[PDB]
Amino acid sequence: MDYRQLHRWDLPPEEAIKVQNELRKKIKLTPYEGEPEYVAGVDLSFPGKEEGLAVIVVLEYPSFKILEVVSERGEITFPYIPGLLAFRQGPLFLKAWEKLRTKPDVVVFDGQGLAHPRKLGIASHMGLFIEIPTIGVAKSRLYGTFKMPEDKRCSWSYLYDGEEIIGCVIRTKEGSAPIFVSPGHLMDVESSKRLIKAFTLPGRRIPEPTRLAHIYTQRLKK
Numbered sequence: 001m002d003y004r005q006l007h008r009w010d011l012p013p014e015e016a017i018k019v020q021n022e023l024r025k026k027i028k029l030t031p032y033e034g035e036p037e038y039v040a041g042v043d044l045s046f047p048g049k050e051e052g053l054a055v056i057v058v059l060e061y062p063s064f065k066i067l068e069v070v071s072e073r074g075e076i077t078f079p080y081i082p083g084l085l086a087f088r089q090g091p092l093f094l095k096a097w098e099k100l101r102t103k104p105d106v107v108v109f110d111g112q113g114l115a116h117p118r119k120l121g122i123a124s125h126m127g128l129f130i131e132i133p134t135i136g137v138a139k140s141r142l143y144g145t146f147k148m149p150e151d152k153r154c155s156w157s158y159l160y161d162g163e164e165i166i167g168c169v170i171r172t173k174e175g176s177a178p179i180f181v182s183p184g185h186l187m188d189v190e191s192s193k194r195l196i197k198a199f200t201l202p203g204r205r206i207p208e209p210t211r212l213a214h215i216y217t218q219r220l221k222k
Ligand SMILES: [Mg+2]
Pocket: 140
């Protein structure tokens, strides 16, 4: 698939932060109504060290049948810094994205989108590059305040930055920790909540797109 190279990747962390502040102006939080036909999930691994692995899985919806898997291996050159995940994982994702032949209607990332100190998590940032609706689904909080939802399945709370809503916290699985859902690009809070709920099977904590991407991350270990 094609994409837009909006800036260079070889940046020190200070310049990388400045780049996020310019890009946040381009995000469009628009509703995503209706149901998607194809849904991509994205996951990364770091087998041993000095060899990253990016996996993209494309599924049919609502069946969740797997239509395509692509993978890319490459060197990781930028440290993990919370809030700068895209600068570590973005380049390898985009090399995998180039090989993708099936165009997804929505792409789900393992990480935040809007629920980010500069409103531009990896889901939002990659959404600007690929120009497809995106959602970030994270297993822990990076940014924002909330009250813990009830322990019943499908209970949920909004994630806040002051007065503004930046995502939601969903108890997808009773007796498990909730997930943190936020829109990326071409996505809003209500639609990302509706879609991740429809992507999550009963009895499972993680939505099918990123759960299956994570599974291939482990099965495609070199
Ligand atoms: Mg952690």
